[PDB]
Symmetry: D2
Subunit: 225 residues, 4 copies
Amino acid sequence: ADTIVAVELDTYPNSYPHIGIDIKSVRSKKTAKWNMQNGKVGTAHIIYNSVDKRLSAVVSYPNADSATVSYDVDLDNVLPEWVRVGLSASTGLYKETNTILSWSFTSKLKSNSTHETNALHFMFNQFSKDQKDLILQGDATTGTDGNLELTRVQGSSVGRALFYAPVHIWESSAVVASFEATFTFLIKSPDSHPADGIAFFISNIDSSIPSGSTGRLLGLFPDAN
Amino acid sequence: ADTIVAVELDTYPNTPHIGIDIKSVRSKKTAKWNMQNGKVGTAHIIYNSVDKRLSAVVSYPNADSATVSYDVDLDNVLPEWVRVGLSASTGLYKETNTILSWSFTSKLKSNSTHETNALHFMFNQFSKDQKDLILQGDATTGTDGNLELTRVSGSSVGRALFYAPVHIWESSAVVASFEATFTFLIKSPDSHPADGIAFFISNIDSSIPSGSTGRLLGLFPDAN
Amino acid sequence: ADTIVAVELDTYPNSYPHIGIDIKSVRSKKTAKWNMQNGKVGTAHIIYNSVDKRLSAVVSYPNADSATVSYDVDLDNVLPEWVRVGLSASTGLYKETNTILSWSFTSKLKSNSTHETNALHFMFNQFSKDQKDLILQGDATTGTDGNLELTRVQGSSVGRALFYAPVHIWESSAVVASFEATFTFLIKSPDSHPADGIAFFISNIDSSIPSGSTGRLLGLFPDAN
Amino acid sequence: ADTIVAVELDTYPNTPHIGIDIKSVRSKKTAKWNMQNGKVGTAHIIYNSVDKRLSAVVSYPNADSATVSYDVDLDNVLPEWVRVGLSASTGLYKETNTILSWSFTSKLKSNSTHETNALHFMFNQFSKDQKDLILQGDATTGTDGNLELTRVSGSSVGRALFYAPVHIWESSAVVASFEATFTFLIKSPDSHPADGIAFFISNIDSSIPSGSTGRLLGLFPDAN
């Protein structure tokens, strides 16, 4: 199975819409109430550092309240050293979209050594149709008004975009490793109470959507069971 | 008087450790520090308004690192606008408190989509006339392209502050965060020297209080 | 007199609206045609580096054409080493505004020395009412919807905002010095053909608006004469 | 075959200089280079679509710098998507082509308000398993935390490419710009060594052509 660490946002009535931190399981290690806002653009900000060992996520909407969830986890003990970072989404049987308007990420490995910092950073505010630096899985596509549609714009759609370059998320010799990620999303549905999930995840480099991970398995987990 | 939050590394008797001071010289949290005389050290200080915890690591090449953290809401402690700086004091010893590099980054992300207000600077080489630094006391710039916080040749305090006020919090921001790194060199010919260096954040017109020598680091006027 | 190097945008019928590079004089060293677009947000991008010694500026409008002007100048020979960088605007006798929606700047001094880079960077996407890191001159004010109004929102208004910290723009020991600046502006007028000027400028640290620098002297020059 | 733009520094006879090569090994522009054996050098390469000029500086500590520039519209030369890398070749000499650090930054700013697509990486320490680098030929990572482009102990070519494709141009961008810095160390025991290092940009599946030894640098298949 893949190793997944995910910060996910979902409305699946398994049980209000919530934001949750998932460490290797769909049974969230920590959750907080999130008030989904149909048709508004949301902003999710994920941050981690190895001195604190605290994975944290804030989701806010313009003019509305922020939902925040934090969880103590040492990712050294959870992930491979080299990973791929990406975005996932799964639709229930409703008409709705999962559009990502922008995605940026920064990883930093600071050594013991004076000024020895290794860093990766990418920022996408505009996705082209041939976004060669992204691995698109599922029903995910780019170029859609310069956006990335993660789910098919077909109920029970699942889609994922991973950044191409493997990311060195930790190292047995860094005094501080840290990453931060931010994406803006828009979830539009015609329906009153649509079931939908978006997640930012970190997995082994060769992760693939497990067979049958639709719905609240979010394109990441093969099973709750 | 001035409002100070500081991460300080010192060896003063008054009974080596790294410590977090929130407004008083009586450290809210300290860890044991293994001062390596003549070796270059690096302090990394980090804070964000989601976790509300101030953390630091000091490391030396060969891997003795020390780290300390304190959960504090700096909105409730600091003014909205602050100046940031480096401070140091020597007891009666021949010693240096050299800063080879210092960099800082501050971000306020709004609830508004495409948020960010940011400030960042990086000093890897100090000039003799370093106009973007406010030098207080015995601090000087330029000696080897470095910053000397105390005077190089027995009781000397010095402080360097970045010129621009920094916006460290704003009421509607979804996350405020800052980060600071500085590499320092404390070189004493004496084996067990009394010395202290600190990264601090203060009201924008902080100046060295009367009597802030020794373990008060140029920061505090008393041991309250 | 101050030393001014400015990239300015103006419609003063002295003589189409143009973008011009000004080195110490209001009599632009180089100009290009600019088609002012009332009520639209424009983006100006200024870049310089000391290897090329080419000061360049691009102004674009969403969906419209770009105006670009470039000029060979070695700023080592023009400016003091330490400067203040800022934004200026002057209105003719028309009703119109000069609103800056965002301003970001980056200066970098790279030494001969391995990894010896000094850098300053600031980004404002939101200006508060008490923007303590800006020196406001003239009729300039902040907090206006989180914007900076450079001119009074009074015909023959002049206003300027300078960043607080002196900037080390060059050095006799850097192998490459460079800066880049970007700001978004909105110029609204009710009038058909309003006369207005906006500039990004670099001056000595203690520059002030010269007495009587209204109109096409832009808050920078004391005289054409 | 592969499309190459390269900034190369070499000492091959074939008659020291830094040069800009746009698709051929016959440099479009060269300047005189004063190779300092055993000293660490730093190459800085810069380009933006407004000026449409590719520029480079190589400096050594003690200030011999060399610089070269060429006015070229890289949209008309390069594919839209490229990979970037470092390349080196040794004649028959004992020598190293060590890379101590390499960093790159690419930006595409749209006409759209709040533009930016960006990529940046910074390597100051290479790992033995450096999965974000594609190593070709004799190049290896990890030796001292460094990248060795040719093999360290007579005719060796090696190239390192960053994994992710880079978007270096887009048709609606108001300015595309990139920047590259790398510090290198060429150490030969021999006084006048034949060697060449290059920063290059290629189609994303460039590989070492047959016969690209010596002055062809692992980049070109012939002297055309």
